[PDB]
Subunit: 198 residues, 4 copies
């Protein structure tokens, strides 16, 4: 068993004009592949340490597992979160969206603001709190994955690492964050919401 780089649900140029094909190819083939490749090696070293009962070595490996494992989790979710033909939120999801945010417009505004405000590299997420049964906006630093680090089940994420938009948008992160809503795969988000309530 090993982790593998998932195929994108679309071709590399399918998200143009919102995300360029060069960003998509680099992001997928170089950035995500690197996280996966490192993840496999780190997981092996971690299993080795844990099997030995070597607590020092297991702790030492934690930042690398979080970063690469998180990188893999986050990008895997991200690819599915996007579509040229996203559709619209499910009836169940919109009820909750209206309940916790008032409207879809309020949700998009709040997620966009929080995401743009990330200092350095990171992610913005729409998440579901299983315990509170409530929808939440959260941000994560670097590749810290949402669920593992907060308990929130990720529904929709926006990658704001500079590699996610710089070639196209340069320093103008807000233009990317607002434009990404045009390609939000609501069908996928709705599916994730349904699973998160199980």
């Amino acid at each position: 068993m090993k982790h593998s780089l998932p195929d994108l649900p679309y071709d590399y140029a399918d998200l143009e004009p919102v995300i360029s094909h060069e960003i998509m190819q680099l992001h997928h083939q170089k950035h995500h592949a690197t996280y996966v490749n490192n993840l496999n090696q780190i997981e092996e070293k971690l299993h080795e340490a844990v099997s030995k009962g070597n607590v020092k070595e297991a702790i030492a490996l934690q930042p690398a597992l979080k970063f690469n494992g998180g990188g893999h989790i986050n990008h895997s979710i991200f690819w599915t979160n996007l579509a040229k033909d996203g559709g619209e939120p499910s009836a169940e999801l919109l009820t909750a969206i209206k309940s916790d945010f008032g409207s879809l417009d309020n949700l998009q505004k709040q997620l966009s603001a929080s995401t743009v405000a990330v200092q350095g590299s990171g992610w913005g997420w729409l998440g579901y709190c299983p315990k509170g049964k409530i929808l939440k906006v959260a941000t994560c630093a670097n590749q810290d994955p949402l669920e593992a680090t907060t308990g929130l089940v990720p529904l929709f994420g926006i990658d704001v690492w500079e590699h996610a938009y710089y070639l196209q948008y340069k320093n103008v992160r807000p233009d990317y964050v607002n434009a990404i809503w045009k390609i939000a795969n609501w069908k996928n988000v709705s599916e994730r919401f349904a699973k998160a309530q199980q």
Copy 2:
């Protein structure tokens, strides 16, 4: 399986620097709890990693560092103390003088850094295998020195309030100063020798 080590001395053997009650609680309750939790968390982590459950493996990280670190830190700490801990080896004293000027200077610097810890944590005299020099470092909570910094621990000062409160109350500096009276230089010297291998 990880186990609570026996102390190298009786619980009252470090009085009047650290009381019987502190030693007993610190060993039988605090360290024991870290060990027990460590075993539980290590088992869960083994399962998660075995099955390639990266989410679960990441989720367990704070608990493993805290409890695993607690086990590492306290295991070292007990061996770092003694009723009569002697003096640094010739080799260690040479290194101390080289890196800190004098034993008094080392004590002063490590004590000051340790006292300055905000909240719970540890003060450490450590050896850097890369620079081949001694260094003062502090760690938050139960973050273990070597796993998190690469520095090999030689002498640690626990400044979690449970390490001194029953006796010293708020006066952490007095505990940090007094612990030098029971520093087990035989052990610190042995750790220094091993760190150089």
Copy 3:
């Protein structure tokens, strides 16, 4: 200048939940130290910012958060406790039931989160002005709730070991459970009303 507030009760008035000695040390030593240090650090920060010394201003940040936070947190904490603290207001109980199902559920959730704090910190019942709902949150060390999260503090549980060790020793959960007996619901209710303005 920042000053140590007088307690709303005598030092032994919270017995047998929190001892006279704990209250006296916690107030006269721990809180007093945060206040004294806060005044020193605020003065240095005023000077640094006045002169546009960004380096110095940044360097003072851990000390200001720790000591300023200590002052904020303990100031609230004293008012959150009482010998006879009554019951939540009608309004607060409605909000508690809405957000947590029951007062018992709130107590359980906040107690569990607070007990789970690794190292030194605080447990808080807070009000989110954005969501207009009650929330359980924890803070590390002296990180103050509102400045760091935006949540308005309503009821806090200090789990720094100095808050309970002399009496409860390692058994933090018993202290966290017992503190509900002296929760000053009059004050929590007043804070809730003010948070809604």
Copy 4:
């Protein structure tokens, strides 16, 4: 009194082929300018809070001051750290370099490795410990400035935020980190070392 965007010691295309003119212009006119502009506003708000004795507000402003103030400190140092004609380390500096690293080659190797290993956005620095009287390699996250956060006096820094190299180097951060040594302003580093020993 206010903070201002310093002029670069050279023209925008002067660091080509090692750093492109588009990177330099964006980095200076957009990224650094943003930090300065925000810094001025945040410092005013902080002075207001501190003058009032409003501890909550002063604490609340800390991340924004660290980030923007740090951004300003770091980039200000960075521009001076580079040159088409850097020269060579001073006699005093090289003695210390040899003492703490064995050689210049060992220093460059170690700083390069640490810098490349930064997870997310950050900086790699050659720093001077005033207390230990020793040279150290350190890294900083996001815009955390070296001296304020560690006590180490910065001598030479390498910006590894993706905006510092992506347009040119794409994902290949190591090529940028190794190539930046070609433009290291040793005269400036030597000057900083001399001041740090005072």
